[PDB]
Amino acid sequence: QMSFTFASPTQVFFNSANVRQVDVPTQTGAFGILAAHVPTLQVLRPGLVVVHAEDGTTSKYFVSSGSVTVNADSSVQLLAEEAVTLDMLDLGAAKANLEKAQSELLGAADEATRAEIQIRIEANEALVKALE
Amino acid sequence: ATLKDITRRLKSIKNIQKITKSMKMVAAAKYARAERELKPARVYGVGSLALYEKADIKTPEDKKKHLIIGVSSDRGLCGAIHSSVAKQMKSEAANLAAAGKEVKIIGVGDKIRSILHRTHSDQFLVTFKEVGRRPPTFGDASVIALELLNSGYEFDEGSIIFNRFRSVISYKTEEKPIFSLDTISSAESMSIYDDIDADVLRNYQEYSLANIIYYSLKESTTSEQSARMTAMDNASKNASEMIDKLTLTFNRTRQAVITKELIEIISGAAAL
Amino acid sequence: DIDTAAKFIGAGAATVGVAGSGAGIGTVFGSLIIGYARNPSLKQQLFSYAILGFALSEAMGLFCLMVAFLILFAM
Amino acid sequence: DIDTAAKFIGAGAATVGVAGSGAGIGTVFGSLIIGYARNPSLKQQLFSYAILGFALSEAMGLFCLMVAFLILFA
Amino acid sequence: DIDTAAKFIGAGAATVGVAGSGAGIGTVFGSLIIGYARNPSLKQQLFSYAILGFALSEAMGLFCLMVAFLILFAM
Amino acid sequence: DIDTAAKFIGAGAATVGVAGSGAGIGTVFGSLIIGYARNPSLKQQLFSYAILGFALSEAMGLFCLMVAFLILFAM
Amino acid sequence: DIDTAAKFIGAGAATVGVAGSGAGIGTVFGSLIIGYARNPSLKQQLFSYAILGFALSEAMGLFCLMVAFLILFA
Amino acid sequence: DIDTAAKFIGAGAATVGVAGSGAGIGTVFGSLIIGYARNPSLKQQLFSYAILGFALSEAMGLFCLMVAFLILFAM
Amino acid sequence: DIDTAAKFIGAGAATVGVAGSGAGIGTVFGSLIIGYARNPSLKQQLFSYAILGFALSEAMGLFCLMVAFLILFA
Amino acid sequence: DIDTAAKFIGAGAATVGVAGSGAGIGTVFGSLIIGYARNPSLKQQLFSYAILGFALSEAMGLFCLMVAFLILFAM
Amino acid sequence: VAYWRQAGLSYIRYSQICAKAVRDALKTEFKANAMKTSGSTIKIVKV
């Protein structure tokens, strides 16, 4: 079966525990990992991962970015730079920051600066959809 | 001996004892923080290294360019840890240079640069300072990884050399590999991994470099703080016993002075 | 009886058009299998899309069958 | 006459062009399923693209039926 | 009679419509193979969807075959 | 008539070539959906490629329709 | 008698149904190749499913062929 | 003349082969879209391959078209 | 002869079963290319399965062609 | 004449099969494009497999053309 | 390849930016103790 490890630099959510199904958002596309998934090495994009416990229970966590590894022997490591429980966020703050970020979006100084700001919009949009 | 010289010595050693006691106290608090901070960082680092453990990657021998990273601080009142990591760095650099491989150094901390300045300073790319002033955090790992990748050196294989923390008194100088993408994509052992482009691997390696750097920083900070704690404790106990001896010497000298002064006074009174 | 033979041949050639619905339904359910293997938690939405693809190619299957029976029976 | 017989044959042949449209509809909706499963946050745009592809691959077989009915009653 | 000849003609033409079940079953089981390759833990539900899709293409296979048999004998 | 009757049969047989164009259009737009789902950041160029793909499937699967009308109307 | 002509035309017409078997077999074994390359560790279940798809496609393929011969042998 | 009738029927049943070219060109452009979506940095080479596949499938369809026109015009 | 005519058109009708096997061969070689581009280390087993698919779909194409040749000379 | 009519109809029916080759080349070249966009360094081997598949679909396309010409011209 | 790879960025900058954009959306009580241990105090010295 699965051996899942969900970790941020300052926190550990699952320390080689066991779960039934983990739906991760990845850069190429979100997918669900089960007891014998095929080995993959995806990186993360700002989204929310849902973890199905051994019972029918489920939990949600917003991951800013990171990396997901699905080892051959069904060992899964999901590392996130900032993974926060879904109740630790404000919809108002997310909306305000998204609106502001788009308010200087058209002021694209250089392509690198435009990419930086536009990643800010992408993260804010994914977070808002997570809360709207 | 001389009363004023012994008095100054006793005062100075008392100052040394109490200042090293203060340093021991602050180091104990700092280590208490650092152990709790390291507790999940171990899980994070192990989870990062899981891929390079499960996949038996090796070294494409024809590749030459190599990196060596040493993780320490800029403070040096704890002693042996900087010497140990530096010794491991010299051993690896010498061996790999003898293997005809261009070896480069990035030293995290002022002490690595100081103890390798006289000999290997020409090979350094970048050194970082102001580590250990504040507890390490993932932003430091991010900035170190950025200054590595942005630098004009595309290494083929690297090694991070740090002190793994074992107990309050035990630290071991360990070294962990760091793989370039050219090694990862040109290994037939990892081919089983699905849905990995040539661009997913760039992101994964650029992130696992920061992951291993952060893990090393956490382990090194914890081991350094414990080492400073035990070194200051030993110094305090040595200063305490030395004060204990000096107090006996001071008492003997004071009694001798009293006896000599009374003898001289009674002799002078007998003269007249 | 030349019309009697033409009816038979035309209906036989008309019923071929169900092949397109066969291939299409195979494709939609194969893609449902794949997409449910990838993202299982969207089972419900994937199934609601598979039903739509099913029915909306069975539409053309029924167009071909209706033309076939039209030739066979209703002039 | 024989002419009505050949009209029957022509209608029964021309009505099979709808098979390609059926297969194309199947392909469009199957790839819509796959694309939605890969990126669930693009639902609306993916459905719009699917409906556009449906409209086109539908019209192609619909004109096959149009020619079949034209031959049948003209 | 020429109608008896057209019975065979129409039957041979109507049996052409099994090629659609062809493409359909091929795609369904190929996509089951791929889906089970990626996520083997879902094998039961993947196989259930595969049986559903196979049955749904075989339904039109039997539509074409029953039309052929109807043109042959039961008319 | 006989020759005009065979012209009608020929037009009916010629129109079957539209099936390939229908299948091609389905493939093109399905691939657009998949590619866009992988990369939404290329919507413009992906659609501009599918326009060319549809145009060249359509303008080449419509030659069969054109020659069907050539047989039917003006020999 | 024209019944021989009917039998010959019907036999020639029925056997195109093997085109579906050809396409289905091509697709099944192509997906088997892709699935085996994506995950070699299950090449006994990938192969079981491949031969099962074989059976389920050749069933209708040989149904088309046997109907063709029955038309020739009615 | 039954020969004219057969020329018409043969051209009609011959021009249908462009269906394969239609499906193939659709497949080529769809896979162009998917491949370019996966990595847009070698669009040049992908487009060149797409052009070559287009030309091949178009010419294979033109063989059916020319057989049709050769039966229609010549004999 | 009417029967020689029927034999000719019946063989022509039997010939169209080759298209499905051609499409299947195209699909199997395309998926072989895909699998090789995914897992080049295997290669040999991918080619074994691909030659199996090619030979085995050619089997059905040749079944159609044998039916055509039986229509022509029997 | 009936022979010169049957030969025309049979050739028209026979030249269809190269639609399969057209679809085969379309699939082969599309897969070439995708597989080269995934791992481009295997370009030469991918092209070798592509030309293998193309020639091996042209094999049966040309077989259909040769049976058509054998019926139409010589026999 | 994503739009930040053309622009000349690395996945480290992507991760930093996404992490900060998550930072700014915390409940203001949680931002207090998420600010601590989220800085970059390393100073670089060149050659």
Numbering used by the authors:
A (entry chain H): 15 to 146
B (entry chain G): 1 to 272
C (entry chain Q), E (entry chain R), F (entry chain O), H (entry chain N), J (entry chain M): 1 to 75
D (entry chain P), G (entry chain K), I (entry chain L): 1 to 74
K (entry chain I): 1 to 47
Article sentences:
Adenosine triphosphate (ATP), the fuel of life, is produced in inner membranes of the mitochondria of eukaryotic cells by an embedded molecular machine with a rotary action, called ATP synthase. Mitochondrial ATP synthases occupy the inner membranes of the organelle and form dimers via specific interactions in their membrane domains. Each monomeric unit in the dimeric bovine enzyme described here is an assembly of 28 polypeptide chains of 17 different kinds, organized into a spherical catalytic globular domain that extends from the inner mitochondrial membrane (IMM) into the mitochondrial matrix, attached to an intrinsic membrane domain by a central stalk and a peripheral stalk (PS). This membrane-bound enzyme is a machine that transmits by a rotary action the potential energy of the transmembrane proton motive force, generated by respiration, into the catalytic sites in the extrinsic domain.
The membrane-bound rotor consists of a ring of eight identical c-subunits in close association with a single static a (or ATP-6) subunit, attached to the asymmetrical central stalk (subunits γ, δ, and ε) which extends from the membrane domain and penetrates into the extrinsic globular catalytic domain along its central axis. Focused local refinement of the rotor (c8-ring plus subunits γ, δ, and ε), the stator (subunits OSCP, b, d, and F6 and associated supernumerary subunits e, f, and g) and the membrane domain (subunits a, A6L, b, d, e, f, g, j, k, and the c8-ring) improved the quality of the maps and the resolutions in these regions to 3.5 to 3.7, 4.2 to 6.0, and 3.6 Å. As it rotates, the asymmetrical central stalk brings about structural changes in the three catalytic sites, found mainly in each of the three β-subunits, which alternate with three noncatalytic α-subunits in the spherical extrinsic domain. The inhibition of ATP hydrolysis in the isolated catalytic F1-domain arrests the rotary cycle at the catalytic dwell, and in structures of the inhibited bovine F1-IF1 complex, the rotary cycle has been arrested at 27° to 32° after the pause in the rotary cycle preceding the release of phosphate. In the current structure, the postphosphate release angles are 28.8°, 26.2°, and 25.5° in states 1 to 3, respectively. Therefore, the rotational angle in the F1-domain is not influenced significantly by interactions with the additional components of the intact enzyme that are absent from the isolated F1-domain. The central cavity of the c8-ring contains a poorly defined, noisy density observed also in the porcine and yeast c-rings (S13 A–E). Here, the upper half of this density has been attributed to a mobile lipid (including possibly coenzyme Q10), and the lower half has been ascribed to another mobile lipid and the C-terminal region of the e-subunit, which extends toward the central cavity on the inter-membrane space (IMS) side of the membrane and could just penetrate into the cavity.
